[PDB]
Coordinates of C-alpha atoms in Angstrom, one line a residue:
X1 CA 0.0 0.0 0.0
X2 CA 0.9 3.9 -0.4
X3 CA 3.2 4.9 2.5
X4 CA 2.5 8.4 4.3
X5 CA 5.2 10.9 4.6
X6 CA 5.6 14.4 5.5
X7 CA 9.0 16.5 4.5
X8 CA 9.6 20.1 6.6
X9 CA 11.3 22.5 4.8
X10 CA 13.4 26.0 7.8
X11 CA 9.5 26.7 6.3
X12 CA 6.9 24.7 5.3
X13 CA 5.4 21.5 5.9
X14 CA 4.6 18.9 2.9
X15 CA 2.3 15.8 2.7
X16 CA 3.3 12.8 -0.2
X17 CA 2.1 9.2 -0.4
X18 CA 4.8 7.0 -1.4
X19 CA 5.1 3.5 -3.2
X20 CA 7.1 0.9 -1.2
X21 CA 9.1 1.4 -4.3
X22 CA 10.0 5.3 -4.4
X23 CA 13.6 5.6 -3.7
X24 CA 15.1 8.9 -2.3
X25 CA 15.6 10.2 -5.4
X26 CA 11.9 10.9 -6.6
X27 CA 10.9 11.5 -3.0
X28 CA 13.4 14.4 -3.0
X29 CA 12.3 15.3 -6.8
X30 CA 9.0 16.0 -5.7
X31 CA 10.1 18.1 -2.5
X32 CA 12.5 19.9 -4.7
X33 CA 9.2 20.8 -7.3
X34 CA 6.8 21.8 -4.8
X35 CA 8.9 24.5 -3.5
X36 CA 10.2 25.2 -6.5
X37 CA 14.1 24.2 -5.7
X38 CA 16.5 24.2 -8.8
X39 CA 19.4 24.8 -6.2
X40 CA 19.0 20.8 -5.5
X41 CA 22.7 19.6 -5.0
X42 CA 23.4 21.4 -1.7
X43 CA 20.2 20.2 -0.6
X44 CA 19.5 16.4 0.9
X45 CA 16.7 14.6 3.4
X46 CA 17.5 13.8 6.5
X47 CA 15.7 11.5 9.0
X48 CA 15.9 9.8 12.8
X49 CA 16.7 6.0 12.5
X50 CA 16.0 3.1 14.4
X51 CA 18.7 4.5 16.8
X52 CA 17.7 7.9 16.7
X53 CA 20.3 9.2 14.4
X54 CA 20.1 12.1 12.6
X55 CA 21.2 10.3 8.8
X56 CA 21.0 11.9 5.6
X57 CA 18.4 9.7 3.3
X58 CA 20.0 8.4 0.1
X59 CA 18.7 9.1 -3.1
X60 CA 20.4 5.6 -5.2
X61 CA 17.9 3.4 -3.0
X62 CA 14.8 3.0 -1.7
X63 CA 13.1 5.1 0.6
X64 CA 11.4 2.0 2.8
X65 CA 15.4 0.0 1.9
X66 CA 17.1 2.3 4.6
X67 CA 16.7 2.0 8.1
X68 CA 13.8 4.1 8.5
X69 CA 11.4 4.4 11.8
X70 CA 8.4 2.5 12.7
X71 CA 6.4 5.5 12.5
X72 CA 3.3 6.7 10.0
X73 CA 4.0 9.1 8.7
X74 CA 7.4 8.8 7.9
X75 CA 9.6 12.3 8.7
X76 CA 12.1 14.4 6.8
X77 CA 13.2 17.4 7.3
X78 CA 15.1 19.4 4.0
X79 CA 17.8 20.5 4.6
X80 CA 21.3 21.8 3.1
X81 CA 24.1 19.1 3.5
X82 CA 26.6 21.2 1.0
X83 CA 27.6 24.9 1.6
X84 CA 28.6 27.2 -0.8
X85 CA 32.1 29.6 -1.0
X86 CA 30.4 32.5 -1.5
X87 CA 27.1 33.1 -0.7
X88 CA 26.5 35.8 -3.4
X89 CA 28.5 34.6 -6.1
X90 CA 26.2 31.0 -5.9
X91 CA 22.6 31.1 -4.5
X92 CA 21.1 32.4 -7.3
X93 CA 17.3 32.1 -6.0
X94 CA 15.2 33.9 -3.1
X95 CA 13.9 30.2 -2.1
X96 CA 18.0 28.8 -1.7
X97 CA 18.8 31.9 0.1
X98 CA 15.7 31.8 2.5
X99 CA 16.2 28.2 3.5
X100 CA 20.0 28.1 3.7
X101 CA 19.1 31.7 6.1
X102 CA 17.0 30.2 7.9
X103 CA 19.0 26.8 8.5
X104 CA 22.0 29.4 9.3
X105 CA 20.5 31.5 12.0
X106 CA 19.0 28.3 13.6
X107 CA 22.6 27.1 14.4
X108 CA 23.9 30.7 15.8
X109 CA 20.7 31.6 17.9
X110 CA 21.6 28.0 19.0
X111 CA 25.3 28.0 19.9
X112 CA 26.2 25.5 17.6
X113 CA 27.8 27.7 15.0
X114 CA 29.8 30.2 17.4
X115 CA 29.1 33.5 16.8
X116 CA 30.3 37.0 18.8
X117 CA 28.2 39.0 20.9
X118 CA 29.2 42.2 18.7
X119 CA 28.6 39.8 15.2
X120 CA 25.3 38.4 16.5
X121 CA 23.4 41.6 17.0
X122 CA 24.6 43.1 13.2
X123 CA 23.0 39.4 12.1
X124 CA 19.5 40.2 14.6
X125 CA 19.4 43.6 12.7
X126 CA 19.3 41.7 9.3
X127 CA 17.0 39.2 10.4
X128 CA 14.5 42.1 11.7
X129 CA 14.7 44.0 8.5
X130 CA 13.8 40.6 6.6
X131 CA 10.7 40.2 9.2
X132 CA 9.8 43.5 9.4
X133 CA 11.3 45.6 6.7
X134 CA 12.0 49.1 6.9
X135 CA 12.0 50.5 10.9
X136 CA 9.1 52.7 11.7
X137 CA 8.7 54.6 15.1
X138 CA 4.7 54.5 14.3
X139 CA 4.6 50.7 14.6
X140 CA 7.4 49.4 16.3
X141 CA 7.3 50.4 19.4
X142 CA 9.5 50.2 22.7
X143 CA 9.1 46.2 23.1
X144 CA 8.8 45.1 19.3
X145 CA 11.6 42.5 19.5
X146 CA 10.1 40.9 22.6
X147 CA 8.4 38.5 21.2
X148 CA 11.7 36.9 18.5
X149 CA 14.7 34.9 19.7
X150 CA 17.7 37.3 18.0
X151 CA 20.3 36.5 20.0
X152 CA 22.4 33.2 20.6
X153 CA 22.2 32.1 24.3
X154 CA 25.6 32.1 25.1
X155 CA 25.6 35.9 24.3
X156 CA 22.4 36.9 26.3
X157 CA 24.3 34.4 29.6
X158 CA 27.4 36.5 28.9
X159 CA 26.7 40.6 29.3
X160 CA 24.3 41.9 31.7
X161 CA 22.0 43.7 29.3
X162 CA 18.3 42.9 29.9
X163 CA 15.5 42.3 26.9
X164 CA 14.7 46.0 26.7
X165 CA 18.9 47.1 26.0
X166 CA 19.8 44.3 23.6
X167 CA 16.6 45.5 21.6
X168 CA 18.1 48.8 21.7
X169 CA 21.3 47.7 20.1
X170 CA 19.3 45.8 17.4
X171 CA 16.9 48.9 16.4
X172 CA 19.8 51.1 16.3
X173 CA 21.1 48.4 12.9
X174 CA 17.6 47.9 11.6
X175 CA 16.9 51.6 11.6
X176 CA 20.2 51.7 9.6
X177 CA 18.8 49.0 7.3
X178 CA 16.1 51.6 6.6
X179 CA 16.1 51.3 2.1
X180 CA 16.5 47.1 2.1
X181 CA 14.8 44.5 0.4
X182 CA 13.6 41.9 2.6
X183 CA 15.9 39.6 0.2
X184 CA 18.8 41.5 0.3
X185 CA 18.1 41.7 3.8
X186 CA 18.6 37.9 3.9
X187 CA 21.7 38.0 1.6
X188 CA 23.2 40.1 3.6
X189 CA 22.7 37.7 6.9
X190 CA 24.1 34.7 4.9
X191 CA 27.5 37.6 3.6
X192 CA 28.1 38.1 7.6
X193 CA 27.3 34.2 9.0
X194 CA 29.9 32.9 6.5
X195 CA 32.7 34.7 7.5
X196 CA 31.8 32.5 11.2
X197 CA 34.8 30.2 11.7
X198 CA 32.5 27.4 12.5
X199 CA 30.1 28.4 9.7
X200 CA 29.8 24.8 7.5
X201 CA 32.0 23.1 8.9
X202 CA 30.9 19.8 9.6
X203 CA 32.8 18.6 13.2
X204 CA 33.6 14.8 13.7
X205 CA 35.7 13.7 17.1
X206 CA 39.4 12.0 15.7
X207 CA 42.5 10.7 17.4
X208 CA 45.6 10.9 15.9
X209 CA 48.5 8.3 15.2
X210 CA 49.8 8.7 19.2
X211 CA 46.2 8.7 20.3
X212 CA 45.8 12.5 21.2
X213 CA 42.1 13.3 20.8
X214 CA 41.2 15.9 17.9
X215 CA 38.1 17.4 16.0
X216 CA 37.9 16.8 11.8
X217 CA 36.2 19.8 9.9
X218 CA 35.0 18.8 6.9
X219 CA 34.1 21.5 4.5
X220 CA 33.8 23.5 1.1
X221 CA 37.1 24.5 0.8
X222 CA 38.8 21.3 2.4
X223 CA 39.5 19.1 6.0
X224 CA 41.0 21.1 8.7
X225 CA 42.4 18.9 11.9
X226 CA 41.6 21.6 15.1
X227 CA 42.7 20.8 18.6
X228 CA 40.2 19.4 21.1
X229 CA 39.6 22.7 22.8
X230 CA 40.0 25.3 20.0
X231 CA 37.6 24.0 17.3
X232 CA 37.6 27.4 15.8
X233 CA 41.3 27.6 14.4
X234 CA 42.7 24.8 12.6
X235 CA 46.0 23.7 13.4
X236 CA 46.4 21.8 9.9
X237 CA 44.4 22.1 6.3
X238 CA 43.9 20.3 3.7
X239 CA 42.3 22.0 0.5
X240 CA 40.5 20.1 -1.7
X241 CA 42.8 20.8 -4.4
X242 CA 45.9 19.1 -2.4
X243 CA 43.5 16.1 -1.7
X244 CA 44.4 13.0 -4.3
X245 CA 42.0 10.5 -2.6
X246 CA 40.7 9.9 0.7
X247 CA 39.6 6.4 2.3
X248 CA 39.1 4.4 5.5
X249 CA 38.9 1.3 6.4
X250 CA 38.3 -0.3 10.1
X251 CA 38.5 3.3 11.8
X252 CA 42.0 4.2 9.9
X253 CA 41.4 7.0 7.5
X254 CA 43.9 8.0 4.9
X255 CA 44.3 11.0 3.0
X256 CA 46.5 10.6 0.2
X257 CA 48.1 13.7 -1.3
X258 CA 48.2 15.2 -5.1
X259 CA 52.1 15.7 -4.4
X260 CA 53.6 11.9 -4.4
X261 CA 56.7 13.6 -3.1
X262 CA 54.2 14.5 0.3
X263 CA 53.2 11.5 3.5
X264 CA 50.1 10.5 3.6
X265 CA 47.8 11.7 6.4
X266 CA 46.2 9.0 9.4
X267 CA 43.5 10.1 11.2
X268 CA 40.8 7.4 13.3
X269 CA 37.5 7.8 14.0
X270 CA 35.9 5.1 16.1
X271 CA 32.2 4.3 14.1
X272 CA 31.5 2.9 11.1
X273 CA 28.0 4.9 11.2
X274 CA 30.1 8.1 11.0
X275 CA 33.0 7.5 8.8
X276 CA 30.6 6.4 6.1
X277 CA 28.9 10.1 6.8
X278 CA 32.4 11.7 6.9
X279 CA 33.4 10.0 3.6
X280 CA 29.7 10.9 1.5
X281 CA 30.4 15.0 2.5
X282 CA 33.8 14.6 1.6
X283 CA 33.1 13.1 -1.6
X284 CA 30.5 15.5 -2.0
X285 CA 32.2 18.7 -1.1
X286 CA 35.3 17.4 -3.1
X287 CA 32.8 17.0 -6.5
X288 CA 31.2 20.5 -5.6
X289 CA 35.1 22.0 -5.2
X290 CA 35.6 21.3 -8.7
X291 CA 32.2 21.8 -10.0
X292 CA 32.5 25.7 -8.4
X293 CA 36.5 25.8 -10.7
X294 CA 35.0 24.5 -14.1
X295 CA 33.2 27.0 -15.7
X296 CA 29.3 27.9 -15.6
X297 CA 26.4 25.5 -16.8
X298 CA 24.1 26.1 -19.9
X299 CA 21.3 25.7 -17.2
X300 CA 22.4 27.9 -13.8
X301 CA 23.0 30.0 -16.8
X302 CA 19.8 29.9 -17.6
X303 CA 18.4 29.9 -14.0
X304 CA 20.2 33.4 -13.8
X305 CA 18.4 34.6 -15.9
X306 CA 15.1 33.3 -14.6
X307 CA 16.2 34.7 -11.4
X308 CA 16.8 37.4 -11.9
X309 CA 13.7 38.3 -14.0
X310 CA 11.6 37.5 -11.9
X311 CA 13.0 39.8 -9.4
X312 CA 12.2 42.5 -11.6
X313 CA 8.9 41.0 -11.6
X314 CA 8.6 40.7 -7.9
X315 CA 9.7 45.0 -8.0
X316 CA 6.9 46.0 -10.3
X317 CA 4.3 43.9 -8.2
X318 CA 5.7 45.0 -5.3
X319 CA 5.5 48.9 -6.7
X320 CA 1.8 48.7 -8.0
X321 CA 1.0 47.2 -4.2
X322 CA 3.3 50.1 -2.3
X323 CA 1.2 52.7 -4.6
X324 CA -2.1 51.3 -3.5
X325 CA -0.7 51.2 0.0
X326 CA 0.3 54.9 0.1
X327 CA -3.3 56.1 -1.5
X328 CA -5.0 54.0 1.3
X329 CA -3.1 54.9 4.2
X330 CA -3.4 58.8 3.2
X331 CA -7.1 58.1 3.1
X332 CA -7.7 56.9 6.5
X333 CA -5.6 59.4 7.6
X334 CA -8.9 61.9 8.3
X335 CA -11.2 59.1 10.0
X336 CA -10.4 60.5 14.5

Protein backbone atom coordinates (compact mmCIF):
# COMPACT_ATOMS: atom_id res chain seq x y z
CA UNK A 1 0.00 0.00 0.00
CA UNK A 2 0.86 3.88 -0.45
CA UNK A 3 3.25 4.94 2.54
CA UNK A 4 2.45 8.45 4.34
CA UNK A 5 5.19 10.88 4.59
CA UNK A 6 5.59 14.38 5.48
CA UNK A 7 9.00 16.45 4.46
CA UNK A 8 9.60 20.09 6.59
CA UNK A 9 11.30 22.54 4.85
CA UNK A 10 13.41 25.97 7.76
CA UNK A 11 9.54 26.71 6.27
CA UNK A 12 6.94 24.66 5.30
CA UNK A 13 5.41 21.46 5.90
CA UNK A 14 4.56 18.92 2.94
CA UNK A 15 2.34 15.84 2.69
CA UNK A 16 3.27 12.79 -0.17
CA UNK A 17 2.08 9.24 -0.41
CA UNK A 18 4.76 6.97 -1.43
CA UNK A 19 5.07 3.55 -3.17
CA UNK A 20 7.13 0.93 -1.20
CA UNK A 21 9.07 1.39 -4.28
CA UNK A 22 10.04 5.32 -4.35
CA UNK A 23 13.61 5.63 -3.74
CA UNK A 24 15.08 8.91 -2.27
CA UNK A 25 15.57 10.23 -5.38
CA UNK A 26 11.93 10.92 -6.57
CA UNK A 27 10.89 11.52 -3.01
CA UNK A 28 13.43 14.39 -2.97
CA UNK A 29 12.27 15.32 -6.84
CA UNK A 30 9.02 16.03 -5.67
CA UNK A 31 10.11 18.14 -2.50
CA UNK A 32 12.46 19.95 -4.67
CA UNK A 33 9.16 20.76 -7.33
CA UNK A 34 6.84 21.77 -4.84
CA UNK A 35 8.85 24.52 -3.54
CA UNK A 36 10.17 25.18 -6.45
CA UNK A 37 14.14 24.21 -5.66
CA UNK A 38 16.53 24.24 -8.77
CA UNK A 39 19.41 24.78 -6.19
CA UNK A 40 18.97 20.85 -5.50
CA UNK A 41 22.69 19.62 -5.00
CA UNK A 42 23.43 21.36 -1.75
CA UNK A 43 20.15 20.25 -0.58
CA UNK A 44 19.52 16.41 0.89
CA UNK A 45 16.69 14.59 3.38
CA UNK A 46 17.49 13.79 6.47
CA UNK A 47 15.75 11.54 9.00
CA UNK A 48 15.85 9.83 12.82
CA UNK A 49 16.73 6.01 12.49
CA UNK A 50 16.04 3.07 14.41
CA UNK A 51 18.72 4.50 16.76
CA UNK A 52 17.74 7.88 16.70
CA UNK A 53 20.31 9.19 14.38
CA UNK A 54 20.07 12.07 12.58
CA UNK A 55 21.17 10.30 8.81
CA UNK A 56 21.01 11.90 5.55
CA UNK A 57 18.42 9.67 3.26
CA UNK A 58 19.97 8.43 0.14
CA UNK A 59 18.71 9.09 -3.05
CA UNK A 60 20.39 5.64 -5.15
CA UNK A 61 17.89 3.39 -2.99
CA UNK A 62 14.84 3.01 -1.66
CA UNK A 63 13.15 5.13 0.63
CA UNK A 64 11.36 1.97 2.77
CA UNK A 65 15.41 -0.03 1.88
CA UNK A 66 17.12 2.34 4.59
CA UNK A 67 16.68 2.04 8.14
CA UNK A 68 13.76 4.13 8.51
CA UNK A 69 11.41 4.43 11.82
CA UNK A 70 8.37 2.49 12.68
CA UNK A 71 6.40 5.47 12.49
CA UNK A 72 3.32 6.72 10.00
CA UNK A 73 3.99 9.15 8.71
CA UNK A 74 7.42 8.75 7.94
CA UNK A 75 9.55 12.34 8.65
CA UNK A 76 12.07 14.41 6.77
CA UNK A 77 13.16 17.39 7.33
CA UNK A 78 15.05 19.37 3.95
CA UNK A 79 17.77 20.47 4.59
CA UNK A 80 21.32 21.77 3.08
CA UNK A 81 24.07 19.12 3.50
CA UNK A 82 26.58 21.22 1.01
CA UNK A 83 27.59 24.87 1.56
CA UNK A 84 28.59 27.22 -0.85
CA UNK A 85 32.06 29.57 -0.99
CA UNK A 86 30.38 32.51 -1.47
CA UNK A 87 27.10 33.14 -0.70
CA UNK A 88 26.49 35.81 -3.38
CA UNK A 89 28.49 34.56 -6.11
CA UNK A 90 26.20 30.95 -5.89
CA UNK A 91 22.64 31.11 -4.52
CA UNK A 92 21.07 32.37 -7.27
CA UNK A 93 17.31 32.07 -6.05
CA UNK A 94 15.23 33.90 -3.11
CA UNK A 95 13.91 30.25 -2.09
CA UNK A 96 17.96 28.77 -1.67
CA UNK A 97 18.79 31.93 0.13
CA UNK A 98 15.71 31.83 2.45
CA UNK A 99 16.24 28.20 3.49
CA UNK A 100 20.03 28.15 3.66
CA UNK A 101 19.08 31.74 6.14
CA UNK A 102 17.00 30.24 7.89
CA UNK A 103 19.02 26.78 8.51
CA UNK A 104 22.03 29.40 9.27
CA UNK A 105 20.54 31.54 11.96
CA UNK A 106 18.96 28.33 13.65
CA UNK A 107 22.62 27.12 14.44
CA UNK A 108 23.86 30.73 15.78
CA UNK A 109 20.72 31.64 17.88
CA UNK A 110 21.60 27.96 19.03
CA UNK A 111 25.29 27.96 19.86
CA UNK A 112 26.16 25.50 17.63
CA UNK A 113 27.82 27.75 15.02
CA UNK A 114 29.83 30.15 17.39
CA UNK A 115 29.09 33.50 16.78
CA UNK A 116 30.29 36.96 18.75
CA UNK A 117 28.18 38.98 20.88
CA UNK A 118 29.16 42.22 18.75
CA UNK A 119 28.55 39.79 15.25
CA UNK A 120 25.30 38.40 16.50
CA UNK A 121 23.41 41.65 17.05
CA UNK A 122 24.59 43.13 13.21
CA UNK A 123 23.02 39.36 12.12
CA UNK A 124 19.53 40.15 14.60
CA UNK A 125 19.41 43.59 12.75
CA UNK A 126 19.29 41.72 9.26
CA UNK A 127 17.04 39.24 10.41
CA UNK A 128 14.47 42.10 11.72
CA UNK A 129 14.67 44.05 8.54
CA UNK A 130 13.82 40.57 6.63
CA UNK A 131 10.72 40.21 9.22
CA UNK A 132 9.79 43.51 9.44
CA UNK A 133 11.26 45.64 6.67
CA UNK A 134 11.97 49.11 6.87
CA UNK A 135 12.04 50.55 10.85
CA UNK A 136 9.08 52.66 11.65
CA UNK A 137 8.66 54.62 15.07
CA UNK A 138 4.68 54.55 14.29
CA UNK A 139 4.62 50.70 14.60
CA UNK A 140 7.39 49.37 16.32
CA UNK A 141 7.25 50.39 19.41
CA UNK A 142 9.47 50.17 22.73
CA UNK A 143 9.10 46.24 23.15
CA UNK A 144 8.78 45.14 19.30
CA UNK A 145 11.63 42.50 19.54
CA UNK A 146 10.14 40.93 22.62
CA UNK A 147 8.43 38.45 21.24
CA UNK A 148 11.69 36.93 18.50
CA UNK A 149 14.69 34.87 19.69
CA UNK A 150 17.67 37.33 18.03
CA UNK A 151 20.35 36.52 19.97
CA UNK A 152 22.43 33.20 20.63
CA UNK A 153 22.16 32.12 24.32
CA UNK A 154 25.58 32.09 25.10
CA UNK A 155 25.57 35.91 24.32
CA UNK A 156 22.42 36.94 26.34
CA UNK A 157 24.29 34.41 29.56
CA UNK A 158 27.38 36.54 28.88
CA UNK A 159 26.66 40.57 29.25
CA UNK A 160 24.26 41.93 31.67
CA UNK A 161 22.05 43.69 29.31
CA UNK A 162 18.33 42.93 29.87
CA UNK A 163 15.50 42.26 26.90
CA UNK A 164 14.69 46.00 26.73
CA UNK A 165 18.93 47.12 26.05
CA UNK A 166 19.83 44.34 23.63
CA UNK A 167 16.56 45.47 21.56
CA UNK A 168 18.07 48.83 21.74
CA UNK A 169 21.27 47.67 20.06
CA UNK A 170 19.28 45.81 17.39
CA UNK A 171 16.95 48.87 16.44
CA UNK A 172 19.83 51.06 16.28
CA UNK A 173 21.12 48.43 12.89
CA UNK A 174 17.61 47.89 11.61
CA UNK A 175 16.92 51.65 11.59
CA UNK A 176 20.24 51.69 9.61
CA UNK A 177 18.82 48.97 7.27
CA UNK A 178 16.15 51.57 6.63
CA UNK A 179 16.09 51.33 2.10
CA UNK A 180 16.50 47.14 2.15
CA UNK A 181 14.75 44.48 0.40
CA UNK A 182 13.64 41.90 2.60
CA UNK A 183 15.86 39.60 0.15
CA UNK A 184 18.85 41.50 0.32
CA UNK A 185 18.10 41.66 3.84
CA UNK A 186 18.63 37.88 3.88
CA UNK A 187 21.75 37.95 1.58
CA UNK A 188 23.19 40.15 3.64
CA UNK A 189 22.68 37.67 6.95
CA UNK A 190 24.14 34.74 4.95
CA UNK A 191 27.47 37.65 3.58
CA UNK A 192 28.10 38.09 7.63
CA UNK A 193 27.28 34.22 9.05
CA UNK A 194 29.90 32.92 6.48
CA UNK A 195 32.66 34.65 7.46
CA UNK A 196 31.82 32.52 11.20
CA UNK A 197 34.82 30.17 11.68
CA UNK A 198 32.50 27.45 12.49
CA UNK A 199 30.12 28.39 9.68
CA UNK A 200 29.84 24.84 7.53
CA UNK A 201 32.04 23.08 8.95
CA UNK A 202 30.95 19.81 9.65
CA UNK A 203 32.84 18.57 13.20
CA UNK A 204 33.64 14.78 13.69
CA UNK A 205 35.70 13.72 17.11
CA UNK A 206 39.43 12.01 15.71
CA UNK A 207 42.51 10.68 17.36
CA UNK A 208 45.56 10.94 15.90
CA UNK A 209 48.53 8.33 15.24
CA UNK A 210 49.82 8.74 19.24
CA UNK A 211 46.24 8.66 20.28
CA UNK A 212 45.75 12.52 21.18
CA UNK A 213 42.10 13.30 20.79
CA UNK A 214 41.24 15.87 17.91
CA UNK A 215 38.09 17.41 15.96
CA UNK A 216 37.93 16.80 11.78
CA UNK A 217 36.25 19.79 9.90
CA UNK A 218 35.00 18.82 6.89
CA UNK A 219 34.13 21.49 4.53
CA UNK A 220 33.76 23.54 1.06
CA UNK A 221 37.12 24.51 0.75
CA UNK A 222 38.82 21.32 2.38
CA UNK A 223 39.49 19.08 6.01
CA UNK A 224 40.97 21.09 8.66
CA UNK A 225 42.37 18.89 11.90
CA UNK A 226 41.63 21.57 15.14
CA UNK A 227 42.68 20.80 18.60
CA UNK A 228 40.19 19.36 21.13
CA UNK A 229 39.61 22.72 22.76
CA UNK A 230 39.99 25.31 20.03
CA UNK A 231 37.59 24.02 17.35
CA UNK A 232 37.64 27.35 15.76
CA UNK A 233 41.30 27.60 14.40
CA UNK A 234 42.66 24.82 12.58
CA UNK A 235 46.00 23.68 13.39
CA UNK A 236 46.42 21.84 9.94
CA UNK A 237 44.42 22.07 6.26
CA UNK A 238 43.95 20.30 3.74
CA UNK A 239 42.31 22.03 0.54
CA UNK A 240 40.53 20.06 -1.69
CA UNK A 241 42.80 20.83 -4.40
CA UNK A 242 45.93 19.10 -2.41
CA UNK A 243 43.53 16.09 -1.73
CA UNK A 244 44.43 12.98 -4.33
CA UNK A 245 42.03 10.55 -2.57
CA UNK A 246 40.67 9.86 0.71
CA UNK A 247 39.64 6.38 2.32
CA UNK A 248 39.13 4.37 5.48
CA UNK A 249 38.92 1.29 6.43
CA UNK A 250 38.35 -0.32 10.14
CA UNK A 251 38.49 3.25 11.84
CA UNK A 252 41.99 4.23 9.95
CA UNK A 253 41.38 7.03 7.49
CA UNK A 254 43.94 8.01 4.95
CA UNK A 255 44.30 11.01 2.98
CA UNK A 256 46.48 10.63 0.23
CA UNK A 257 48.10 13.68 -1.29
CA UNK A 258 48.18 15.15 -5.09
CA UNK A 259 52.12 15.68 -4.38
CA UNK A 260 53.57 11.91 -4.43
CA UNK A 261 56.67 13.58 -3.10
CA UNK A 262 54.23 14.54 0.33
CA UNK A 263 53.18 11.50 3.50
CA UNK A 264 50.13 10.49 3.61
CA UNK A 265 47.77 11.74 6.44
CA UNK A 266 46.20 8.98 9.35
CA UNK A 267 43.53 10.10 11.20
CA UNK A 268 40.79 7.37 13.29
CA UNK A 269 37.46 7.80 13.99
CA UNK A 270 35.87 5.08 16.11
CA UNK A 271 32.15 4.29 14.13
CA UNK A 272 31.53 2.92 11.06
CA UNK A 273 28.03 4.86 11.18
CA UNK A 274 30.13 8.08 10.96
CA UNK A 275 33.01 7.52 8.76
CA UNK A 276 30.56 6.43 6.12
CA UNK A 277 28.89 10.09 6.76
CA UNK A 278 32.41 11.68 6.88
CA UNK A 279 33.37 10.02 3.60
CA UNK A 280 29.72 10.92 1.45
CA UNK A 281 30.43 14.96 2.52
CA UNK A 282 33.79 14.63 1.64
CA UNK A 283 33.06 13.09 -1.63
CA UNK A 284 30.48 15.54 -2.00
CA UNK A 285 32.15 18.71 -1.06
CA UNK A 286 35.31 17.42 -3.09
CA UNK A 287 32.80 16.96 -6.52
CA UNK A 288 31.21 20.54 -5.59
CA UNK A 289 35.08 22.00 -5.25
CA UNK A 290 35.56 21.25 -8.72
CA UNK A 291 32.23 21.77 -10.03
CA UNK A 292 32.54 25.65 -8.40
CA UNK A 293 36.48 25.81 -10.75
CA UNK A 294 34.96 24.46 -14.13
CA UNK A 295 33.19 26.97 -15.66
CA UNK A 296 29.29 27.93 -15.59
CA UNK A 297 26.38 25.45 -16.85
CA UNK A 298 24.10 26.14 -19.88
CA UNK A 299 21.29 25.66 -17.21
CA UNK A 300 22.36 27.91 -13.81
CA UNK A 301 23.00 30.02 -16.84
CA UNK A 302 19.78 29.95 -17.64
CA UNK A 303 18.38 29.88 -13.99
CA UNK A 304 20.20 33.37 -13.80
CA UNK A 305 18.43 34.58 -15.88
CA UNK A 306 15.08 33.33 -14.58
CA UNK A 307 16.16 34.74 -11.38
CA UNK A 308 16.83 37.43 -11.92
CA UNK A 309 13.68 38.27 -14.04
CA UNK A 310 11.62 37.46 -11.89
CA UNK A 311 13.00 39.78 -9.39
CA UNK A 312 12.23 42.45 -11.63
CA UNK A 313 8.95 40.96 -11.58
CA UNK A 314 8.62 40.74 -7.87
CA UNK A 315 9.69 44.96 -7.96
CA UNK A 316 6.94 46.04 -10.32
CA UNK A 317 4.26 43.87 -8.19
CA UNK A 318 5.75 45.02 -5.32
CA UNK A 319 5.55 48.90 -6.75
CA UNK A 320 1.78 48.66 -8.04
CA UNK A 321 0.98 47.17 -4.21
CA UNK A 322 3.33 50.05 -2.33
CA UNK A 323 1.24 52.67 -4.64
CA UNK A 324 -2.13 51.33 -3.49
CA UNK A 325 -0.66 51.24 -0.02
CA UNK A 326 0.30 54.91 0.11
CA UNK A 327 -3.35 56.06 -1.54
CA UNK A 328 -5.03 53.98 1.28
CA UNK A 329 -3.11 54.91 4.20
CA UNK A 330 -3.40 58.75 3.17
CA UNK A 331 -7.07 58.07 3.06
CA UNK A 332 -7.66 56.86 6.46
CA UNK A 333 -5.65 59.39 7.61
CA UNK A 334 -8.87 61.88 8.32
CA UNK A 335 -11.17 59.06 10.02
CA UNK A 336 -10.38 60.47 14.54
Amino acid sequence: KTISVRVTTMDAELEFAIQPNTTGKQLFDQVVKTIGLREVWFFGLQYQDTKGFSTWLKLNKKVTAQDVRKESPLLFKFRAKFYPEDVSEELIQDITQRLFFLQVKEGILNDDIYCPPETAVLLASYAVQSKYGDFNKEVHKSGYLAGDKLLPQRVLEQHKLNKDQWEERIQVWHEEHRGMLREDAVLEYLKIAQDLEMYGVNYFSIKNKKGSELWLGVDALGLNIYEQNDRLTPKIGFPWSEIRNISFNDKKFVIKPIDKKAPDFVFYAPRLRINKRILALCMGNAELYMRRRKPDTIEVQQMKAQAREEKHQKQMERAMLENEKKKREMAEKEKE
